[PDB]
């Protein structure tokens, strides 16, 4: 791998300012973040500023504590890219589903280290 689980969380699930959140956005972002070799079945990107995400995981102090699962208090603007039609290799076909909702993440050392991607499957 490369850096920490937090840095991977950001490259895999964070996109501050999307220039449109439609199906074209997914076709582009999935290719850009390297999620098309082979075609990934589903992938959600979180929007807005980073501090709001880091805040889901904050602790009173910094005394080492085990990792735990948390449901964020407030809602977030997210965009979920879902594979459509079963294309297994590029050109991967996707469809975007935009949303505003809470997210479930694993937290450690005050940073998000994993997104619960299964909750975005919906229908």
């Amino acid at each position, epitope marked *: 791998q490369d850096n920490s689980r937090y840095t991977h969380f950001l490259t895999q699930h964070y996109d501050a300012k999307p220039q449109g959140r439609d199906d074209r956005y997914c076709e582009s972002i999935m290719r850009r973040r*390297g999620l098309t*070799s*082979p075609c*990934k*079945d589903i992938n959600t990107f979180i929007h807005g500023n980073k501090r709001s995400i880091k805040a889901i995981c904050e602790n009173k102090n910094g005394n080492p504590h085990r990792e735990n699962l948390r449901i964020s208090k407030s809602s977030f603007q997210v965009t979920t890219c879902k594979l459509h*039609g*079963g294309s*297994p*290799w590029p*050109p991967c076909q996707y469809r975007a589903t935009a949303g505003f909702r809470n997210v479930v993440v694993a937290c450690e050392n005050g940073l998000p280290v994993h997104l619960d991607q299964s909750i975005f499957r919906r229908p």
Partner: antibody
Amino acid sequence: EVMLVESGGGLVKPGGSLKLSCAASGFTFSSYTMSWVRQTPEKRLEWVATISSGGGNTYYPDSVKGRFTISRDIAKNTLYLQMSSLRSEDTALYYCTRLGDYGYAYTMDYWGQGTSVTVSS
Amino acid sequence: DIVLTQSPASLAVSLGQRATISCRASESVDNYGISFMSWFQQKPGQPPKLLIYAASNQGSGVPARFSGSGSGTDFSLNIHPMEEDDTAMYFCQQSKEVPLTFGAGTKLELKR
């Protein structure tokens, strides 16, 4: 349970054409990506073509691109391999296979018993 | 293409002992924490049968004596205890990218 019956193979003259078919049953055909894989006389396995569950994506190896065409008749639950400008190198046993999805790491979970093709004069 | 070098080409193992077959890829077959690698078993007079997918998961109805391991560019299939019914031709195969490619195969026979 699952079944894939191939047919249509035979002896064809070099330069000729041939169309293979695969009758699928026992599962929801249109809900799966499908492929053709051949086994040469020397016993090697060579991927020949794939078509997606939706039907919009087809893929081919450089060796047969421009000569082979895979397709599907939803109604008849049947996959096809249209072969043209056949060469002696195309002599082999052609298998019909079902591809698993992302969750199965795009593996081939079911193989039919195959139909043979012999390209010769 | 991702070239798969499978070895050895042939091997004979005694009952109860173990068979180890390896497959080395010229490039990684991994992504998203998954190894897009499969192992197939082909007995005489029959088409190939799925043995292992995602490098280490058992296909349906596949005995625990068959286990696959590895990641990146190096993979292995181990059979232990070897049984008389395991005589067959085995192949590895990658699905990370097209063209899909197979290893050249391993011929496994029972030693007696």
